[PDB]
Design a protein around this ligand. Structure first.
Ligand SMILES: CO[C@H]1O[C@H](CO)[C@@H](O)[C@H](O[C@@H]2OC[C@@H](O)[C@H](O)[C@H]2O)[C@@H]1O
Ligand SMILES: CO[C@H]1O[C@H](CO)[C@@H](O)[C@H](O[C@@H]2OC[C@@H](O)[C@H](O)[C@H]2O)[C@@H]1O
Ligand SMILES: CO[C@H]1O[C@H](CO)[C@@H](O)[C@H](O[C@@H]2OC[C@@H](O)[C@H](O)[C@H]2O)[C@@H]1O
Ligand SMILES: CO[C@H]1O[C@H](CO)[C@@H](O)[C@H](O[C@@H]2OC[C@@H](O)[C@H](O)[C@H]2O)[C@@H]1O
Lengths: 141, 138
């Protein structure tokens, strides 16, 4: 709504829906992984107030992406597959107009990729439970 | 503008349809792979048609009804007798899913659109549909 563009929601239908909504500016993204992707922590700006959100499960190790001045998320890729009877993100990575990150996780599966030729990622939405079942993004020029 | 993707190889020649006011229909030509696609859409009062890719293949057409948009595109890019091209391609409207069309698998890709729509295409084409991307709008 309000002219938002939300693409994807890659993963399984398990867990419970989460939605960060779009950010005025993303400060950092911390991906937590082990065999698969556990969760994602996002620190951003909204209404001139800094916020942090915790999505997915609490396990895994942290991998942090800090966006410098003028750096933006222009790509997201990963893999979805089964893990103990549940379809979730086995791998996840991002790219910025400066460098690529990840992928993080170790469980292979059905790949997916979202290279962005024009525009950037501005927020996240998806599904979380014990792990990160599904992840999608908000886009903007 | 929001341009996502460009799934496929680096062969062929670049093509950019640019955004449309409203897409009318899309025809996908496929055989072993995805030969090409035709797009009929309105644009500032005029009705236009564009073709990307080669001339081979059999067509599969998607005709959008009133208040019907493309909210998804899936397929598979792979190495066909030496050329990295789209081996399979399909689309989804807010009411039905089409294809994918083509019979050559490879590394998959998919783009469900929870909010917004596909307003145009861009990519690369030659004898076949080398690569394809889309423009997105609210
Ligand atoms: C099976 O355990 C491995 O895979 C899990 C899923 O990716 C992952 O969460 C596990 O990591 C641990 O989770 C619990 C935390 O308290 C630990 O610090 C963390 O290492 C593990 O990688
Ligand atoms: C191990 O189960 C927990 O973690 C899973 C992966 O994160 C997650 O999918 C599970 O959620 C359940 O999935 C099946 C649905 O029918 C349930 O309503 C949902 O809670 C669970 O969080
Ligand atoms: C069979 O070759 C034609 O069809 C291919 C698939 O569509 C296409 O990739 C080919 O394009 C050439 O690829 C190699 C480049 O170096 C050339 O410049 C390009 O024309 C060709 O159209
Ligand atoms: C190898 O031939 C099959 O796969 C090709 C790539 O998808 C495809 O183009 C071929 O289709 C034919 O192309 C030439 C036209 O004149 C034919 O009518 C058409 O069937 C074929 O599917």
């Amino acid at each position: 709504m309000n002219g938002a563009i939300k693409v994807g929601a890659w993963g399984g239908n398990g867990g419970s829906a989460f939605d960060m909504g779009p950010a005025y500016r993303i400060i950092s993204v911390k991906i937590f992984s082990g065999d698969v992707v556990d969760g994602v922590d996002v620190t951003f700006t909204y209404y001139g107030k800094t916020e942090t959100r915790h999505y997915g499960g609490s396990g895994g190790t942290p991998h942090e992406i800090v966006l410098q001045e003028g750096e933006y998320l222009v790509g997201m890729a990963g893999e979805v597959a089964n893990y103990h009877g549940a379809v979730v993100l086995g791998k996840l990575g991002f790219s910025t107009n400066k460098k690529a990150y990840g992928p993080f996780g170790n469980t292979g599966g059905t790949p997916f990729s979202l290279p962005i030729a024009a525009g950037k990622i501005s927020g996240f939405f998806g599904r979380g439970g014990k792990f990160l079942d599904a992840i999608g993004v908000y886009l903007e020029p």
